[PDB]
């Protein structure tokens, strides 16, 4: 009965991540536009079917949702969890609404998120705005293939929406967003073998390190995580590459959805304040989070029926 929000897209080459506040007395503004965010996505994206592949899903953060919504919350949604490691930082930013926006084709994010901006004129101010760019074979701007282990299909569905568990909010999801920019100088400074001891795979054929081989700081190590029942804990992420030459910006715009957000933090645990047997993921020597917000992207049939 509930229809997810396209939380599992095909892949995309472009996307816009904006995310918004919402000002004193801008929620009745807020929730007409969410009742109609479904109906301008087609509005936008109809016209380029089926290539264009344009798809909103749009997430509310936990005070936000006690601004715009009474009753019954979703179990999980709590304001981004600022993780203070000795060494690595995961800051928590301000952050209402995320309209997480994707299509084979920038134009396509812009002109739906020039409508949605649109709606909200007088009622939210901007906070991040990034527009992300497909970087080679699926790469990131460390020169590495991104999204490989990723779930697909069934084991993705399983793993990014809400169900059983949650029954009144089944088919949302909880999406994490942190803004990283890297020191590209300090990276470039390793070599190629030090830098697969940095991330866990190599580099040009994106091969898993040995068991044997795979240092326990490496990113894949410290975000590989077994359940208590001996399953493999998932996210789906959706990273995308963006920055600006000018300013020597080189960033990855991170995403990660999971059906709680107990998963995701797990990760971001063992990343910024490591483990028995690592101080902290190696990546975040050449990675900065500049923002961290979490949000509950609700089943499609929430928003339309407000
Ligand atoms: C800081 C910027 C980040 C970069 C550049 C990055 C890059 C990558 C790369 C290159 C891989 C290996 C290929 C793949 O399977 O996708 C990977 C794997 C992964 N990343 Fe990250 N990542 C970042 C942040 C994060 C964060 C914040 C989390 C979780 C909160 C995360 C979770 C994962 C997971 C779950 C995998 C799959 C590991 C496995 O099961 O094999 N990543 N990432
Ligand atoms: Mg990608
Ligand atoms: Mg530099
Ligand atoms: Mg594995």
Same mark, same amino acid.
């Given at each position: 009965?509930?229809?997810?929000?396209?939380?599992?897209?095909?892949?995309?080459?472009?996307?816009?991540?904006?995310?918004?506040?919402?000002?004193?007395?801008?929620?009745?503004?807020?929730?007409?536009?969410?009742?109609?965010?479904?109906?301008?996505?087609?509005?936008?994206?109809?016209?380029?079917?089926?290539?264009?592949?344009?798809?909103?899903?749009?997430?509310?953060?936990?005070?936000?949702?006690?601004?715009?919504?009474?009753?019954?919350?979703?179990?999980?949604?709590?304001?981004?969890?600022?993780?203070?490691?000795?060494?690595?930082?995961?800051?928590?930013?301000?952050?209402?609404?995320?309209?997480?926006?994707?299509?084979?084709?920038? *134009?396509?994010?812009?002109? !739906?998120?020039? $409508?949605?901006?649109? /709606?909200?004129? @007088?009622?939210?101010?901007?906070? &991040?705005?990034?527009?992300?760019?497909?970087?080679?074979?699926?790469?990131?701007?460390?020169?590495?293939?991104?999204?490989?282990?990723?779930?697909?299909?069934?084991?993705?569905?399983?793993?990014?929406?809400?169900?059983?568990?949650?029954?009144?909010?089944?088919?949302?999801?909880?999406?994490?967003?942190?803004?990283?920019?890297?020191?590209? *100088?300090?990276?470039?400074? !390793?070599?190629? $073998?030090?830098?697969? /001891?940095?991330? @866990?795979?190599?580099?040009?054929? &994106?091969?898993?390190?040995?068991?044997?081989?795979?240092?326990?700081?490496?990113?894949?190590?410290?975000?590989?995580?077994?359940?208590?029942?001996?399953?493999?804990?998932?996210?789906?992420?959706?990273?995308?590459?963006?920055?600006?030459?000018?300013?020597?910006?080189?960033?990855?715009?991170?995403?990660?959805?999971?059906?709680?957000?107990?998963?995701?933090?797990?990760? !971001?645990?063992?990343?910024?304040?490591?483990?028995?047997?690592?101080?902290?993921?190696?990546?975040?020597?050449?990675?900065?989070?500049?923002?961290?917000?979490?949000?509950?992207?609700?089943?499609?049939?929430?928003?339309?029926?407000?």
């Amino acid at each position: 009965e509930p229809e997810p929000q396209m939380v599992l897209s095909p892949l995309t080459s472009a996307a816009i991540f904006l995310v918004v506040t919402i000002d004193s007395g801008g929620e009745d503004t807020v929730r007409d536009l969410l009742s109609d965010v479904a109906s301008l996505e087609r509005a936008v994206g109809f016209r380029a079917q089926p290539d264009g592949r344009l798809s909103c899903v749009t997430g509310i953060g936990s005070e936000a949702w006690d601004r715009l919504f009474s009753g019954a919350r979703p179990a999980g949604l709590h304001p981004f969890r600022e993780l203070d490691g000795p060494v690595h930082r995961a800051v928590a930013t301000p952050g209402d609404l995320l309209f997480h926006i994707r299509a084979s084709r920038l *134009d396509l994010c812009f002109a !739906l998120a020039t $409508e949605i901006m649109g /709606r909200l004129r @007088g009622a939210v101010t901007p906070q &991040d705005e990034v527009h992300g760019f497909k970087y080679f074979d699926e790469r990131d701007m460390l020169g590495f293939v991104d999204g490989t282990e990723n779930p697909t299909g069934a084991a993705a569905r399983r793993a990014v929406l809400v169900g059983a568990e949650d029954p009144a909010f089944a088919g949302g999801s909880y999406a994490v967003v942190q803004k990283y920019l890297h020191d590209i *100088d300090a990276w470039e400074g !390793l070599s190629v $073998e030090a830098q697969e /001891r940095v991330i @866990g795979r190599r580099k040009m054929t &994106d091969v898993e390190l040995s068991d044997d081989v795979k240092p326990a700081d490496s990113h894949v190590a410290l975000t590989s995580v077994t359940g208590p029942d001996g399953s493999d804990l998932e996210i789906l992420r959706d990273n995308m590459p963006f920055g600006s030459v000018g300013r020597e910006e080189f960033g990855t715009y991170f995403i990660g959805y999971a059906r709680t957000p107990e998963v995701t933090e797990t990760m !971001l645990e063992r990343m910024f304040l490591g483990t028995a047997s690592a101080p902290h993921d190696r990546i975040l020597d050449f990675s900065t989070a500049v923002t961290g917000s979490l949000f509950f992207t609700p089943a499609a049939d929430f928003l339309e029926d407000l």
